[PDB]
Amino acid sequence: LVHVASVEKGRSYEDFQKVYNAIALKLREDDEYDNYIGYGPVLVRLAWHISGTWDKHDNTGGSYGGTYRFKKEFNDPSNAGLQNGFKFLEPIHKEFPWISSGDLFSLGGVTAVQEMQGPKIPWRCGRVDTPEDTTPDNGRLPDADKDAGYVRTFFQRLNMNDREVVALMGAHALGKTHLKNSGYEGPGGAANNVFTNEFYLNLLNEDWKLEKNDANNEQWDSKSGYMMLPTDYSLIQDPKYLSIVKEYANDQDKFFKDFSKAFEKLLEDGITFPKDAPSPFIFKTLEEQGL
Ligand code: HEM
Ligand SMILES: Cc1csc[n+]1C
Secondary structure (H helix, E strand, O other): OEEEOOOOOOOHHHHHHHHHHHHHHHHHHHHOOOHOOHHHHHHHHHHHHHHOOOOOOEOOOOOOOOOOOOOHOOOOOHHHHOOOOOOOHHHHHHOOOOOHHHHHHHHHHHHHHOOOOOOOOOOOOOOOOOOOOOOOOOOOOOOOOOHHHHHHHHOOOOOOOOOHHHHHHHHOOOOOOOOHHHHHOOOOOOOOOOOOOHHHHHHHHEEEEEEEOOOOOEEEOOOOOEEEEEEHEEEEEEOHHHHHHHHHOOOHHHHOOOHHHHHHHHOOOOEOOOOOOOEEEOOOHHHHOOO
């Protein structure tokens, strides 16, 4: 399967910076969502789940085709709760009907991270919508109730290595688990709509307790009111993972730099970019624009 990036006709940096600003302006406006967390965390989760279907072996799945717009992927049990990120973006797609679905879902994730004061993420245009029959089947996204060997093995399919996996998981400092979506409940920290390295700090400094929640699932709970998933706590159980966790709890700039590279790579897996294709765009935030 080859998927070649095709820039939307005649579009350039300024067009996509207009779509960025539209998403970012609505993130500021619709602030009440999920008890004032706002839409940013569900939008970086949506960009991860449309990319996380990729399989390196046959180049199926991935962010290129925008296939989450089809019922099979929209109704995947693993995507429960992401309909709220879709409905947030649907106004903006009506306003810029020329951007492809893959591009709009991935730029929403980029915009949310930078607007929640994360690192800049280089983003590239050119994903092309593909037919309903290209939609990957349910079951390619990871279970939460498993251990470190499962996480390592699952992420080899998206060929991410240990460092990349640990840098990507730092995004679980954002938002929260919702019992009616996943059977898990609670936030992982106090700053859950500002991008920081707090996931790593909480993992190493809190007093975790294995408890059973109302959906009868086990999760790691702390006195402070935070929770960690079994696959999250996995990172301090494995010796290779645990020493990268310590590296990111001791250096927030290295965390930001490595997250930026692994999230771009995540979003680009499966796509062939021609050598005459434009460079990756670095978008300015509303704040850097005085907007
Ligand atoms: C083995 C890996 C992973 C598993 C099992 C997993 C699982 C989960 C689960 C069960 C939730 C709760 C969903 C809900 O109830 O609403 C969640 C939320 C979230 N995850 Fe993951 N995740 C994984 C990796 C990642 C990665 C790599 C990213 C992003 C780079 C990510 C970003 C998020 C975000 C931002 C949320 C919060 C959503 C919200 O607030 O609504 N996840 N994760
Ligand atoms: C807050 C959250 C959602 S999924 C994992 N964590 C830590």
